[PDB]
Amino acid sequence: LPRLPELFETSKKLLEDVEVATEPTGSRTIQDKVSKGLELLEKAAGMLSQLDLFSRNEDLEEIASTDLKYLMVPALQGALTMKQVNPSKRLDHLQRAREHFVHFLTQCHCYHAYPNLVAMASQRQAKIERYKQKKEVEHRLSALKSAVESGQADDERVREYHLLHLRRWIAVSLEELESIDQEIKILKEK
């Protein structure tokens, strides 16, 4: 019996497959995974609406640690929409994807000699810390992944693990939205 957790995880792995796949993304096999992930996430979202886990438009601390991951559904939906290949409908995809990424963002609850040389110095390492962070984040996620997916991590690690995934999805959704609007604008310029 097709259950929510299974729906999510399958879809998640399916996307991770597609993002790493090396053949043209227009490949029969890739497009199949994309189509399947879209379909399962549609079903999952359908169920998430029934459950209404985050009805209360506040909280966050108050969400069950393992429910946290369902927050990322609209994000996975946007990412997979953006992997479809059908030139003649490209704009439809953009607009579908745009809805998901926003829809995501509006549910995440996630929110969150001297002078010139000094600025140069402070403005330099800034970018090094930005790279670092990016690296640390990914390193941490990969360290916890197994245990969290296995049910072997304590609640602190599980909650930490998903909030961190959430942040990552914020940045990603913001960039994607920027890219989407740029391309949509050209496609509608008449």
Side-chain angles (χ1 to χ4, degrees), residues 115-126:
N116 299 97
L117 265 327
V118 176
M120 278 161 62
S122 287
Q123 124 219 320
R124 180 73 38 68
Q125 53 151 17

Side-chain angles (χ1 to χ4, degrees), residues 17-150:
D17 286 351
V18 175
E19 279 176 338
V20 66
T22 44
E23 51 278 0
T25 59
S27 294
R28 160 121 308 268
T29 61
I30 286 181
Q31 284 308 287
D32 287 7
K33 311 195 157 209
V34 166
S35 301
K36 183 168 168 159
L38 266 349
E39 197 206 327
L40 275 48
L41 247 18
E42 204 188 350
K43 180 90 189 179
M47 305 182 164
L48 265 329
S49 292
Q50 220 48 46
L51 287 174
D52 195 13
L53 273 12
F54 333 88
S55 189
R56 184 140 62 183
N57 48 270
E58 9 247 17
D59 299 13
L60 182 282
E61 331 290 289
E62 321 304 325
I63 286 68
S65 284
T66 188
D67 288 345
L68 265 7
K69 67 188 173 168
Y70 293 135
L71 248 12
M72 282 160 286
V73 168
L76 304 161
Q77 279 173 302
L80 282 163
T81 304
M82 288 299 284
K83 278 281 180 169
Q84 291 176 283
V85 173
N86 189 190
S88 36
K89 310 299 188 304
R90 175 65 173 169
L91 166 64
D92 158 47
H93 301 150
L94 276 347
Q95 307 205 87
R96 243 73 283 147
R98 187 179 200 275
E99 289 159 347
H100 289 308
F101 281 122
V102 171
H103 177 76
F104 170 68
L105 287 172
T106 81
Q107 277 121 214
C108 67
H109 306 99
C110 14
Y111 307 119
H112 35 84
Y114 41 138
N116 299 97
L117 265 327
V118 176
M120 278 161 62
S122 287
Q123 124 219 320
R124 180 73 38 68
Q125 53 151 17
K127 219 182 296 178
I128 85 186
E129 289 127 29
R130 184 147 52 110
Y131 189 69
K132 206 198 302 177
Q133 279 175 125
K134 193 199 206 315
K135 173 187 286 185
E136 246 64 86
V137 167
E138 320 254 341
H139 171 87
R140 207 166 172 98
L141 259 21
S142 52
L144 262 22
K145 168 129 167 159
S146 241
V148 170
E149 295 184 344
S150 288

